[PDB]
Amino acid sequence: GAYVLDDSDGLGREFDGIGAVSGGGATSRLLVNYPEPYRSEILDYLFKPNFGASLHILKVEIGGDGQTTDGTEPSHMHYELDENYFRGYEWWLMKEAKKRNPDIILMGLPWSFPGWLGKGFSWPYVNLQLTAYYVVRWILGAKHYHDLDIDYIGIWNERPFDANYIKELRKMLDYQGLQRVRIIASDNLWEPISSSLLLDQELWKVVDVIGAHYPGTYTVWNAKMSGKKLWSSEDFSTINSNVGAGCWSRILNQNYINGNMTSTIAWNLVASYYEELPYGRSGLMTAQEPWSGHYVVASPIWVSAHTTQFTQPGWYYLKTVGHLEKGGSYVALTDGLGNLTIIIETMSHQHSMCIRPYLPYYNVSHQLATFTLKGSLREIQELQVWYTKLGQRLHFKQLDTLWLLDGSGSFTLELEEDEIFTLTTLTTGRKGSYPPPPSSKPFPTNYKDDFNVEYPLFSEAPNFADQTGVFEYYMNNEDREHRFTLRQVLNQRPITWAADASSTISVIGDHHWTNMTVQCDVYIETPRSGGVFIAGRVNKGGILIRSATGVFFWIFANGSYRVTADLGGWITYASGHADVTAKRWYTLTLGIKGYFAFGMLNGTILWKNVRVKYPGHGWAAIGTHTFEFAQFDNFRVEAAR
Ligand SMILES: *[C@@H]1O[C@H](CO)[C@@H](O[C@@H]2O[C@H](CO)[C@@H](O)[C@H](O)[C@H]2NC(C)=O)[C@H](O)[C@H]1NC(C)=O
Ligand SMILES: *[C@@H]1O[C@H](CO)[C@@H](O[C@@H]2O[C@H](CO)[C@@H](O)[C@H](O)[C@H]2NC(C)=O)[C@H](O)[C@H]1NC(C)=O
Ligand SMILES: *[C@@H]1O[C@H](CO)[C@@H](O[C@@H]2O[C@H](CO)[C@@H](O)[C@H](O)[C@H]2NC(C)=O)[C@H](O)[C@H]1NC(C)=O
Ligand SMILES: *[C@@H]1O[C@H](CO)[C@@H](O)[C@H](O)[C@H]1NC(C)=O
Ligand SMILES: OC[C@H]1NNC[C@@H](O)[C@H]1O
Ligand SMILES: [Ca+2]
């Protein structure tokens, strides 16, 4: 009926911010080669204050060279004694975010680790000092090379934590003058981290935040007992249709209401990865076409705005928050300066399902809500109004100012389902706008890269999405024809997060492609045992990269070749001998049309008319037989979709 909003008996918990995740894995991959002005517009929609999503928090993967859901991300230490703070795109992303919002909150978290850290095992806790050293080096490098202060460091994404590790990490941070960096644990379930904090005073002292993943808006008693900040440190992960926007809307409110969670962070920030990779289009917005410049400012961008534009880290929740009698919810926040923001959501069950977890049916119907301002809030006589109706739809439209002339300190709204209202004393709101970007277009049916770039802006060529191993721009001054190539740089399997393939592979192009010719120059660096391939119709990647089928054309340095239907090479289409050795450049051509394929070595037919599964479709790819050095040059693909 009537809902009292008051601060007279005190406040709720301090609000910590809303944010999102770039990484886990390669989610921002296709954003970096967007042309201007579009790339900048996109970043504005995400990070510019009083414009779009206006995010408070940006969380990034600390790359460890392993597959971490939609690709691999490069580490700052590929090998022991290697340090490089200019690989990948997270440094870049953090700097761009910080340009737009200097007060943005930055977090880092590992999914995978380089293999050499395991000292013979695929386990990051064999040598605690070494793994901590690796992680703290990343934080120092953020400061020293990019001028970034990292605000939070995590442990091991959705993987077990080690209590001694967390203690060592704290000790190591302090030792490096990083006392201001805070630790969040354990980026998995509420347990066992929450009970561990109650049983262990030394652990409790070194953990600042408990971050849980996909909590379904609820927490647990031990976490409440701990007296720590509780965050939903990863959530969302749903397609950014109106449905995903509903999910995002409902949980932004009800994570605090049901779970005492004072921050929620979406996976992922922006869908800049091929859609046919796992969890396609599950960012706050979509930017998966750098070749065309087309992006989509999806509904979740404006759902975020209803909170982010009108709240800031350091505001407090009121004690008076809760559910609406006939479905939906409301929260209210103040800054202690006389401002007040009220956020109301009436998301229906059928239009707000998240993938994790799936809620049992709940009912939402039309209602009227009366709000009365008590305490220091009663003196407010004016409120700005912002409204969204999820579809057709109607996004972040500003409505007529609401007045409380009465002295009643009270007002009433008619609510329907799937709506959001934000009522705030703040006048800075804005639905940011750029002109529409170019129309969507498929990946170019003809495409080439000679990798001839002497001072590349990024460490890898555009559109190549690594799904196992890591491929990088390589300069070899000792060669003239192949001075600038693409190189696979891992020489051992990472401490894996997902199930990386046995073979390295990078995919590119249009998953719809079914007839195609792929050509590339390849160089095998390992004598006798080495091998490489090119391929087409590659149908799976990411977390499923081991499942990938297609047509794979391998040559080996022992004078041999293979044609397989799968990346794992279990299934044979054809095989035989070839004049192939190590440390020599060959040109491979692979042609696939309907039921048949052919391969060429240096322009001369090696095998022809080999029958392959059809129908079938997928990306083009390059790669190596194991985790081994190899080079590639003059990539070309022609395809029909
Ligand atoms: C966490 O939030 C819950 C609400 O979900 C708080 O628990 C109580 O909530 C009921 C209504 O659901 C109120 O009537 C009680 O007043 C709340 N408890 C108290 C002690 O006020 C709970 O307080 C919160 N825990 C914190 C802030 O540590
Ligand atoms: C609401 O918030 C605004 C912005 O934080 C407050 O305005 C600021 O007030 C501080 C001091 O209180 C000044 O130093 C800033 O220059 C002000 N900034 C702007 C943009 O006005 C405002 O006082 C708060 N309270 C109300 C009732 O609006
Ligand atoms: C890919 O190539 C196959 C093989 O040529 C094409 O399939 C043939 O299409 C013609 C005319 O469309 C038919 O008369 C043949 O019977 C088809 N062959 C088979 C085995 O189905 C296919 O259309 C091509 N696809 C694209 C997108 O170019
Ligand atoms: C939802 O609530 C309305 C109002 O009480 C009711 O008429 C309707 O049957 C409910 N729907 C379900 C599925 O229970
Ligand atoms: O929904 C899938 C997400 N889960 N958390 C880890 C992330 O990298 C994603 O795989
Ligand atoms: Ca070249």
Side-chain angles (χ1 to χ4, degrees), residues 1-373 375-392 394-396 398-447 449-479 482-635 637 639-641:
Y3 310 95
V4 171
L5 301 176
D6 191 17
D7 68 331
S8 182
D9 197 44
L11 295 168
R13 279 180 178 229
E14 175 187 29
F15 167 77
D16 290 317
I18 308 299
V21 178
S22 164
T27 57
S28 299
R29 181 64 184 98
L30 295 178
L31 170 63
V32 310
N33 60 317
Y34 262 78
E36 295 305 345
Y38 312 125
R39 202 181 73 178
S40 192
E41 297 173 348
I42 292 172
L43 292 159
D44 277 5
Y45 277 113
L46 296 171
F47 298 117
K48 188 172 180 199
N50 300 323
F51 193 91
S54 319
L55 295 175
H56 300 140
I57 296 161
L58 168 69
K59 169 168 152 176
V60 309
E61 171 181 356
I62 306 179
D65 298 332
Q67 166 70 232
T68 54
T69 290
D70 296 290
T72 69
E73 295 212 13
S75 173
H76 58 291
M77 303 181 70
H78 287 320
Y79 332 103
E80 200 170 36
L81 302 198
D82 167 65
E83 285 192 52
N84 184 311
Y85 295 97
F86 295 90
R87 302 193 180 109
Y89 28 90
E90 311 299 348
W91 309 113
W92 171 79
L93 189 53
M94 291 191 278
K95 270 179 298 187
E96 292 300 326
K98 189 190 161 169
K99 269 198 279 193
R100 292 158 171 78
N101 181 10
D103 292 318
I104 197 166
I105 291 160
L106 298 170
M107 322 164 66
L109 174 73
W111 271 246
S112 68
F113 298 89
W116 66 275
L117 290 178
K119 293 295 192 197
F121 317 97
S122 186
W123 194 243
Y125 300 130
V126 189
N127 187 334
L128 299 186
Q129 213 199 334
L130 182 56
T131 301
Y133 173 85
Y134 165 90
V135 175
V136 167
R137 273 307 151 293
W138 187 86
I139 295 167
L140 293 177
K143 187 48 183 258
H144 297 159
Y145 294 98
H146 305 282
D147 201 29
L148 302 163
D149 298 326
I150 305 301
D151 300 298
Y152 294 82
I153 182 63
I155 309 309
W156 189 13
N157 186 78
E158 304 177 349
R159 288 299 177 275
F161 72 88
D162 183 294
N164 290 314
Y165 175 68
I166 305 184
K167 295 175 188 175
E168 173 71 51
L169 178 67
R170 173 81 272 155
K171 177 183 176 186
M172 171 97 53
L173 288 160
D174 295 346
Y175 185 65
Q176 297 295 325
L178 296 173
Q179 296 82 342
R180 88 95 107 164
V181 181
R182 304 177 203 255
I183 296 177
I184 181 175
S186 66
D187 274 289
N188 205 355
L189 305 182
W190 295 109
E191 297 294 6
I193 187 63
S194 299
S195 47
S196 295
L197 294 195
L198 299 183
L199 291 177
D200 189 344
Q201 191 181 349
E202 293 307 301
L203 188 58
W204 183 94
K205 287 173 189 159
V206 311
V207 173
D208 304 277
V209 173
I210 302 168
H213 287 195
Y214 302 94
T217 73
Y218 294 103
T219 186
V220 300
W221 185 70
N222 292 334
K224 299 183 199 255
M225 280 300 287
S226 71
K228 304 296 190 174
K229 298 169 167 288
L230 312 182
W231 293 5
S232 184
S233 58
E234 200 182 300
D235 223 331
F236 186 64
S237 176
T238 311
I239 302 188
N240 54 25
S241 64
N242 56 295
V243 166
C247 157
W248 188 230
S249 173
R250 183 169 46 68
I251 70 181
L252 282 174
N253 270 25
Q254 294 186 27
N255 279 348
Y256 179 69
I257 294 174
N258 312 293
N260 312 88
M261 275 163 274
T262 44
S263 172
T264 301
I265 298 169
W267 188 87
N268 47 77
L269 172 70
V270 52
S272 295
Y273 52 97
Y274 299 123
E275 197 168 12
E276 295 86 359
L277 287 166
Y279 305 105
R281 275 215 294 131
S282 294
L284 297 186
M285 58 175 299
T286 306
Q288 66 197 30
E289 292 181 18
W291 47 94
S292 73
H294 182 246
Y295 58 91
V296 185
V297 187
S299 329
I301 291 296
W302 301 117
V303 174
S304 316
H306 274 274
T307 302
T308 55
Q309 296 213 14
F310 307 109
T311 49
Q312 289 284 316
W315 285 37
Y316 282 75
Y317 281 102
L318 299 184
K319 290 190 171 184
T320 54
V321 302
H323 292 275
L324 294 169
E325 178 160 39
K326 304 218 93 189
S329 65
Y330 65 95
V331 299
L333 302 91
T334 68
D335 57 9
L337 291 176
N339 287 294
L340 165 67
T341 294
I342 303 167
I343 309 165
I344 310 173
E345 153 272 325
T346 55
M347 298 302 134
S348 68
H349 172 269
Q350 94 192 109
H351 287 161
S352 70
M353 304 136 53
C354 311
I355 55 164
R356 204 183 297 126
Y358 181 97
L359 293 196
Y361 184 82
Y362 64 97
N363 215 36
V364 177
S365 53
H366 309 64
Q367 54 190 310
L368 284 104
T370 300
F371 293 89
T372 294
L373 313 187
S376 65
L377 306 178
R378 154 182 45 251
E379 334 181 334
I380 299 299
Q381 321 185 5
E382 193 186 4
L383 288 179
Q384 299 311 306
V385 187
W386 293 85
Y387 168 82
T388 301
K389 168 79 187 188
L390 292 184
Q392 183 108 65
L394 202 59
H395 299 334
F396 204 58
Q398 182 167 21
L399 302 193
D400 293 321
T401 304
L402 215 157
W403 300 88
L404 311 174
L405 315 109
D406 202 322
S408 186
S410 180
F411 58 91
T412 309
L413 304 72
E414 204 193 337
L415 314 180
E416 320 205 20
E417 329 92 1
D418 308 337
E419 298 181 346
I420 313 180
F421 284 82
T422 302
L423 321 171
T424 174
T425 62
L426 295 175
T427 60
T428 57
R430 179 191 177 203
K431 176 165 185 162
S433 173
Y434 285 114
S439 68
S440 154
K441 288 152 218 126
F443 199 92
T445 43
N446 218 90
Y447 181 91
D449 202 337
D450 49 26
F451 309 121
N452 299 333
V453 180
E454 189 175 6
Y455 297 107
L457 288 172
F458 297 86
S459 64
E460 189 182 7
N463 302 321
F464 278 93
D466 308 348
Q467 303 301 319
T468 293
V470 175
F471 298 72
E472 299 187 341
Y473 280 122
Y474 186 65
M475 181 174 71
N476 172 17
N477 294 25
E478 301 310 304
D479 191 303
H482 298 291
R483 177 151 104 106
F484 300 110
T485 63
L486 199 69
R487 189 177 195 228
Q488 203 295 120
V489 297
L490 298 194
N491 64 352
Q492 69 175 297
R493 176 170 198 88
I495 294 171
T496 53
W497 186 79
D500 298 52
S502 281
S503 293
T504 66
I505 183 172
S506 191
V507 302
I508 191 166
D510 191 342
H511 192 269
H512 294 83
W513 285 344
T514 171
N515 295 324
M516 68 209 293
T517 304
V518 174
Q519 171 172 329
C520 193
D521 299 337
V522 301
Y523 184 91
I524 300 169
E525 300 200 16
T526 316
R528 271 165 10 253
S529 62
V532 298
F533 71 88
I534 59 173
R537 285 176 181 172
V538 183
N539 65 339
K540 296 293 173 30
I543 224 173
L544 300 178
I545 182 64
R546 265 205 182 267
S547 310
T549 47
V551 185
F552 299 84
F553 179 15
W554 314 74
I555 58 175
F556 300 88
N558 74 329
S560 149
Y561 78 94
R562 259 161 157 78
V563 186
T564 71
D566 58 309
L567 177 56
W570 288 86
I571 294 191
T572 293
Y573 283 147
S575 57
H577 302 310
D579 204 356
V580 172
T581 193
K583 290 164 183 177
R584 180 165 301 120
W585 283 98
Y586 302 96
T587 291
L588 288 179
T589 318
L590 169 68
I592 321 170
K593 187 171 173 48
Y595 277 113
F596 298 94
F598 72 82
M600 289 188 269
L601 184 60
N602 292 339
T604 304
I605 288 295
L606 183 52
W607 49 275
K608 165 185 123 193
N609 268 134
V610 170
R611 191 167 154 163
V612 295
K613 273 290 217 172
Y614 187 82
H617 57 77
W619 303 288
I622 60 176
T624 77
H625 185 235
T626 182
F627 294 88
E628 61 181 273
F629 296 107
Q631 292 177 50
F632 301 80
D633 206 349
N634 311 295
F635 176 85
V637 61
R641 154 178 180 162

